[PDB]
Ligand binder design. Structure first.
Ligand SMILES: *[C@@H]1O[C@H](CO)[C@@H](O[C@@H]2O[C@H](CO)[C@@H](O)[C@H](O)[C@H]2NC(C)=O)[C@H](O)[C@H]1NC(C)=O
Ligand SMILES: *[C@@H]1O[C@H](CO)[C@@H](O[C@@H]2O[C@H](CO)[C@@H](O)[C@H](O)[C@H]2NC(C)=O)[C@H](O)[C@H]1NC(C)=O
Ligand SMILES: [Ca+2]
Ligand code: NA
Lengths: 122, 872, 61
């Protein structure tokens, strides 16, 4: 295909009730739509911060580098425990997981003679 | 709001005076504006720039003729792919990256006639024109190529007026029979190409032409117990065949490139041609079964072969004629939209013109066509529109349809199926289509509507065209703005103010001779959405009348409708202005030797109108699409022009397709001269001793451009006469029987006497005068039996003695040697530089004679040398 | 790797032809245009006897 934005996408993703191009041109003119995902699922929260860039020397996250809303027409899904309805995995992501319990091990403390410690390991 | 527009050809052409329309809705405040064409990745070289001054003076619109000539990279070729349009002005600037072609103009290769015998000279010349349709004087290189795809000779001449006269091309010494090719190109840098073809065959001019007309081009359910075949023979001097004995055979065939076939015995023979005509009805059912076959359905996608032999009953001449084949098919018909742009406007009636064809690519009229339609809404709504019907016109092949779409529409899905009364429902073909709404950020649309199925406009008229702008968020349309293209250069441009009164209003635009072959017009208006102006448009394709700049009119002197076999006569040249003219005389019988057709002119209108960068009936899908599809690309302020999909090649269809008398001089071609015509000229010459129709075509090129005339027929004809059936060549050795008939057209009878004059090397029966008796308005088969001894030797006279007639025939029998024709060749590679490892400067090919040789024959040889050039 | 792609004939030039026993084609290509000649010469210790050329026919032959 060709999004008039320029980006060039796989035809399968055409007339499928999902903005795959970004500009929605891939669904600009469609009569019958082969909907990819038969049921409404949720967006994983902060999914975009796994698609942002990471500046080594600054140790600071920067501008969006991956589009993580792109879904590739595959309706791959993943079920949250402690949250009813399933979440929708994006196409860049091979895996997502939710298993998380807490214990004392998680609450720790350190002593610093001086601030020189923080530089050494990294 | 200030919105600006620039319009330029989609692609530039080298050496074309490329016109660039500039239109703006600026302040009254007049201003200067430079425009230029600069090189790629560096605006260093500026090949041309144009200082167009606009104002309320020119309703804010100008034209500029920029041009791009030979300033380039010639050696180790890297000829540039791209260039840069630029706008420099007080008020604004921008720039475009635009491609560049070296395709410039038209090369018309004019061979003297389309069929030759070996050892004829092929006369040839060229008509070359530039993108502006003027002379375009460039030295040109045609190159001869044999029917084995092998180059042969090559020759240049300079171009003095547009009528380049090359030296005659004698056909080689033992040449290759088939389809020769002449490829013409400019010695200069422009890419331009021309092709032409001639056949080389041993051929003899054929005395009468046998037509053979079948009832249809398909064979199917209706006509399978009967297929009507009319066969119409007549002479080339306009008098039909009285008595003739006919023989028809039929055969099965796989395809049209099929070299051979399987004959069918029991094939209707022996109908007698009577007075111009004969007829038969071919029962395919009863005949086909004598080979393997049993049903028509068995016989699908197979062709039927017809070959006829008409020998004159009373008139010594075999003639032969054949039909390649007629397809036997279930599916009798093909389908294709003729002048239908696949982009629709909502709240408008859509136009649909469909076309029906037979298996052999020609029209068929009187067939009914059902159109089923389905609409889907912006709403995602799905709706069934009401099925229509029409019947394919007979002059067109086109059935027309109109559906008025509910204005909320986006996508139209239409079916088109044929509904012919005799065909099984499943057999009838269908094609389906989708049409798409012109997208408007505006929600704003346009529909300019003009169509005549009557289909032709005449230079001089004034075009009246209806502009309906239904939908736009605001009708605060200030101005309607049009643009008229023709042969890829913008030629007209202008603006009409919106009538508060109209909603729809007229434009009157004068039809001019700049548009003669064809034209497009495009109309856009700016709707300033008070946040980003939108450009909104539509275009339409307009075939118009075929009128020359210099109409040549040719006339023969003695206005009599039949002519005399020796007589001198003057010819008339006519022109609207000083011109050149290039004459041709062709025996109208010689078109008869090849089933294929003469090709000056028909073509000349078409070739010339293939400089249009457009496609479709016009009318796009964006605003950008519209302008692009129309053969343009713009630079723009409100909506920019995006795409580079010029690449996928254009296809749509626009137009639906003493007191002795001595006869001696029988020239196949003559009048191969060119003349300077000061609007007037005349010239006398005695037309050759030969009973045929002379078909003499004159074509003239001038400042204005090219113009081919109506060909002049001129049948020359005698009352009582003799013509012999002489073979191309005869072999010395075996005795031959020479045929030929005397033709008595006089209302009373006569007693006559033929006698042959033999030359030193040719034999005859006795040695008188063998006085016979021909009835009023008939013929008498006369024959002589000769035997050739001296090879190659020519000249036989035939002398005719009659009541009120005395005729002597000057013919030229040709003779060949017995046995075989062995061919043997050798060669060398000349390699002075020992490239191959050994230096080569000489071979010696020794004369060597094998004693198996047929007596009294030369040994020939030919030296062909082909320089072997290589490399990029 | 070059060997593995052998795919288009639309072009209509003749494929590489077959040299005669003890010889070779002087002039390698995949496709030759119709009417091109290729010259046959011989391996070491053998020399050409006769017509040294094949011509490419529109035939493809
Ligand atoms: C993060 O992800 C990985 C899976 O990719 C988890 O690793 C699995 O942990 C379970 C623990 O029950 C094991 O049974 C699996 O064998 C592990 N698989 C792999 C491939 O290592 C890990 O537990 C996750 N961590 C958190 C905190 O959720
Ligand atoms: C056929 O007849 C023509 C004349 O009708 C002969 O040609 C003539 O030849 C003589 C010399 O023999 C010339 O003086 C004449 O001028 C020629 N006449 C013309 C009109 O060209 C020709 O020789 C005859 N051929 C035979 C075999 O008898
Ligand atoms: Ca989509
Ligand atoms: Na109308």
């Amino acid at each position: 295909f060709r999004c008039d934005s320029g980006r060039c996408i796989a035809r399968k993703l055409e007339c499928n009730g999902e903005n795959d191009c970004g500009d929605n041109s891939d669904e600009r003119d469609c009569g019958r739509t082969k909907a990819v995902c038969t049921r409404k699922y949720n967006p994983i929260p902060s999914v975009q911060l796994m698609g942002n860039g990471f500046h080594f020397l600054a140790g600071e996250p920067r501008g969006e580098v991956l589009d993580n809303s792109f879904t590739g027409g595959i309706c791959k899904t993943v079920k949250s425990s402690r949250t009813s309805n399933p979440y929708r995995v994006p196409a860049n992501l091979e895996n997502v997981g939710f298993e998380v319990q807490t214990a004392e091990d998680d609450l720790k403390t350190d002593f610093y003679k001086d601030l020189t410690s923080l530089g050494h390991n990294e | 709001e200030q919105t600006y527009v620039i319009s330029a050809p989609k692609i530039f052409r080298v050496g074309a005076s490329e016109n660039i329309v500039i239109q703006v809705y600026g302040y009254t405040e007049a201003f200067d504006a430079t425009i230029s064409i600069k090189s790629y990745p560096d605006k260093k070289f500026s090949y041309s720039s144009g200082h167009v001054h606009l104002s309320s003076e020119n309703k804010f619109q100008n034209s500029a003729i920029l041009t791009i000539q030979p300033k380039q990279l010639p050696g180790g070729q890297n000829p540039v792919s791209y260039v840069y349009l630029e706008v420099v002005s007080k008020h604004f600037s921008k720039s475009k990256r635009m491609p560049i072609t070296y395709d410039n103009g038209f090369l018309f290769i004019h061979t003297d006639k389309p069929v030759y015998t070996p050892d004829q000279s092929v006369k040839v010349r060229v008509y070359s024109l530039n993108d502006d349709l003027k002379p375009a004087k460039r030295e040109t290189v045609l190159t001869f190529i044999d029917p084995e795809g092998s180059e042969v000779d090559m020759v240049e001449e300079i171009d003095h007026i547009g009528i380049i006269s090359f030296p005659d091309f004698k056909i080689p010494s033992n040449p290759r029979y088939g389809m020769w090719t002449i490829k013409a190109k400019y010695k200069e840098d422009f890419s331009t190409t021309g092709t032409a073809y001639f056949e080389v065959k041993e051929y003899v001019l054929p005395h009468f032409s046998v037509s053979i007309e079948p009832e249809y081009n398909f064979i199917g359910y209706k006509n399978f117990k009967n297929f009507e075949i009319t066969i119409k023979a007549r002479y080339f001097y306009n008098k039909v065949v009285t008595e003739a004995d006919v023989y028809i055979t039929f055969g099965i065939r796989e395809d049209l490139k099929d070299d051979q076939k399987e004959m069918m015995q029991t094939a209707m023979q022996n109908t007698m041609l009577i007075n111009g005509i004969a007829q038969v009805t071919f029962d395919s059912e009863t005949a086909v079964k004598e080979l393997s076959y049993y049903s028509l359905e068995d016989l699908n996608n197979k062709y039927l072969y017809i070959a006829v032999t008409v020998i004159e009953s009373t008139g010594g001449f075999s003639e032969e004629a054949e039909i390649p084949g007629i397809k036997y098919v279930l599916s009798p018909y093909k389908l294709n939209l003729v002048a239908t742009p696949l982009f629709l406007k909502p709240g408008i009636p859509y136009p649909i013109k469909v076309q029906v064809k037979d298996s052999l690519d020609q029209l068929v009229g009187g067939v009914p066509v059902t159109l089923n339609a389905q609409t889907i809404d912006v709403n995602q709504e799905t709706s069934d529109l009401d099925p229509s019907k029409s019947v394919t016109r007979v002059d067109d092949g086109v059935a027309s349809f109109v559906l008025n779409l509910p204005s909320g529409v986006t996508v139209l899905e239409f079916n088109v199926k044929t509904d012919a009364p005799d065909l099984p429902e499943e057999n009838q073909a269908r094609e389906g289509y989708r049409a798409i709404a012109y997208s408007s950020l505006s929600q704003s649309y346009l529909y300019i509507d003009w169509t005549d199925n009557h289909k032709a406009l005449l230079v001089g008229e004034h075009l009246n065209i209806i502009v309906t702008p239904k939908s736009p968020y605001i009708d605060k349309i200030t101005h309607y703005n049009y643009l008229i293209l023709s042969k890829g250069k913008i030629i007209h441009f202008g603006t009409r103010e919106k009538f508060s009164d109209a909603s729809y209003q007229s434009i009157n635009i004068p039809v001019t001779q700049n548009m003669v072959p064809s034209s497009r017009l495009l109309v856009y208006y700016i709707v300033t959405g008070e946040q980003t102006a939108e450009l909104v448009s539509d275009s339409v394709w307009l075939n118009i009348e075929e009128k020359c700049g210099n109409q040549l009119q040719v006339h023969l002197s003695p206005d009599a409708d039949a002519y005399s076999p020796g007589q001198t006569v003057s010819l008339n040249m006519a022109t609207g202005m000083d011109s050149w003219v290039a004459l041709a005389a062709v025996d109208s019988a010689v078109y008869g030797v090849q089933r294929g057709a003469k090709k000056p002119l028909e073509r000349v209108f078409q070739f010339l109108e293939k400089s249009d960068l457009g496609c479709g009936a016009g009318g796009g899908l964006n605003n950008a699409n519209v302008f692009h599809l129309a053969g343009l690309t713009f630079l723009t302020n409100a909506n920019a022009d995006d795409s580079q999909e010029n690449d996928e090649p254009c296809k749509e269809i626009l137009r639906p397709r003493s007191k002795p008398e001595i006869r001696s001089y029988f020239p196949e071609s003559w009048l191969w001269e060119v003349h300077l015509v000061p609007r007037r000229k005349q010239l006398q010459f005695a037309l050759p001793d030969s009973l045929t129709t002379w078909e003499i075509q004159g074509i003239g090129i001038s400042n204005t451009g090219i113009c081919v005339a109506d060909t002049v027929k001129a049948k020359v004809f005698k009352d009582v006469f003799l013509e012999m059936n002489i073979p191309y060549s005869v072999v010395r050795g075996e005795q031959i029987q020479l045929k030929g008939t005397v033709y008595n057209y006089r209302t009373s009878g006569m007693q006559f006497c033929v006698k042959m004059s033999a030359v030193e090397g040719i034999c005859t029966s006795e040695s008188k005068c063998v006085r016979q008796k021909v009835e009023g308005s008939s013929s008498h088969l006369v024959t002589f039996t000769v035997l050739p001894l001296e090879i190659g030797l020519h000249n036989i006279n035939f002398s005719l003695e009659t009541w009120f007639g005395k005729e002597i025939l000057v013919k030229t029998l040709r003779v060949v040697p017995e046995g075989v024709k062995r061919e043997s060749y050798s060669g060398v590679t000349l390699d002075p530089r020992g490239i191959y490892g050994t230096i080569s400067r000489r071979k010696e090919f020794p004369y060597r004679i094998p004693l198996d040789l047929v007596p009294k024959t030369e040994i020939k040889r030919i030296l062909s040398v082909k320089g072997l050039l290589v490399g990029e | 790797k070059e060997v593995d792609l052998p795919e288009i004939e639309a072009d209509s030039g003749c494929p590489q032809p077959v040299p005669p026993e003890n010889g070779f084609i002087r002039n390698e290509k995949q496709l030759y245009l119709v009417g091109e000649d290729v010259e046959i010469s011989c391996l070491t210790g053998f020399e050409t006897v006769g017509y040294q050329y094949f011509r490419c026919l529109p035939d493809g032959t």
